[PDB]
Amino acid sequence: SALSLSNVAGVFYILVGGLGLAMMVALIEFCYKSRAESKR
Amino acid sequence: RGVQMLLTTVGAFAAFSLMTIAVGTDYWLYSRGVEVMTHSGLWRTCCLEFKGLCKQIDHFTAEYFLRAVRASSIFPILSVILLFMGGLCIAASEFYKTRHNIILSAGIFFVSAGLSNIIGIIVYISANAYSYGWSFYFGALSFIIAEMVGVLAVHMFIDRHKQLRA
Amino acid sequence: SVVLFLVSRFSPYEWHDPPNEFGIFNSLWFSLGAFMQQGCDISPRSLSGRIVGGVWWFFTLIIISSYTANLAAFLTVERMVS
Amino acid sequence: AFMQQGCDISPRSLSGRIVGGVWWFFTLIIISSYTANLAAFLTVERMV
């Protein structure tokens, strides 16, 4: 009766996907600003 | 700075070795199966009390996708690869003292390796759905050490850019 | 906590006095207050930090509701038994 | 914290953040237990 990890696995997948998305967004902004500062 | 680099290198080597040992060994789960008490890893199941000869785990649309991901063990292997890449970045940054983006790359690799470890753990437990052996906890400790080393590498990156600011 | 600290503090262009309050220790506090839904000190302001915060908020909401619902199920079922 | 309402000020030191955080865990396991037991009492009238 104790609900298992399979009952809430999808929310874990969503959480890790959101973490990866935030990392990607931050890194893309950093690369864009690096290129802009190289130009300027 | 040198002490931080030493901690980062030792932790990077420790997490990588722990994850490699966990992936290689077969003490992931103590359960009962072919009808004997056995211990299984990611690839082989062998009996405790034949005492030792192993079977390849019979790993076989959402259920099919989960079984394929579990069978390939893509996420623990990817964690091993990312830890290796982080170590390579640490070594290259030791070679190239002026390129600070290598430290950042190493930190990103370590954090990503930890995240891949989390995904692999969740996939393994769901596919299993007993007791957990020392390979499971080796992988968990590898995750913890990888996240600590990633935090420390990000700290080194921040400190170096702060030093350039002044 | 680690990803929140990373996306909040790594970029030197955000620093140009820290750009925000989300160090690793503060990231560990924001994240715990959120899980307990009893937290109100500082809130992430950047896009990626808000992504981390919102996804962690959704995780917390689902997990806490599941805990309460399963505890209610246990208690109701043990009242049912005879 | 117990009433699940507000902060005004938050602890900043390690020990305060340890005291605050174990109070937050108690406040969440006690208030979930209260709600779950009230639901159990209302659903099933185990009746003497």
Residue numbers in the entry:
A (entry chain D): 789 to 828
B (entry chain Z): 6 to 39, 56 to 70, 73 to 83, 93 to 161, 174 to 210
C (entry chain C): 539 to 554, 570 to 635
D (entry chain B): 587 to 634
Question: What do the paper's sentences say?
Answer:
GluA3-G–TARP-γ2 determined in the apo state diverges from existing AMPAR structures in its sequence-diverse NTD tier. Similar to GluA1 receptors, GluA3 lacks the interface between the inner B and D subunit NTDs that is typically observed in GluA2; as a result, the two GluA3 NTD dimers are separated. Furthermore, the GluA3 NTDs stack onto the LBDs—a close apposition of NTD and LBD is apparent throughout 3D classes, where we observe receptors with two upright NTD dimers, both interfacing with the LBD, or those with one upright dimer and a second one bending towards the LBD. GluA3 with two ‘double upright’ NTD dimers accumulated in the centre of the conformational landscape, while receptors with bent NTDs localized to the periphery. Overall, receptors with two upright NTD dimers appear to be a prevalent GluA3 conformation. We constructed a double-upright GluA3-G–TARP-γ2 receptor to a resolution of 2.5–3 Å. Moreover, the NTD closely apposed the LBD, giving rise to a previously unseen NTD–LBD interface. Interface contacts are established exclusively with the LBDs of the A/C subunits (but not with the gating-dominant B/D LBDs), resulting in an outward translation of the NTD dimers that underlies the expanded appearance of the receptor. We measured a >20 Å translation of the inner NTDs towards an A/C LBD, when comparing GluA3 with either a GluA2 homomer or a GluA2/3 heteromer, using the GluA3 marker residues Arg183 (NTD) and Tyr471 (LBD) and the corresponding markers in GluA2.
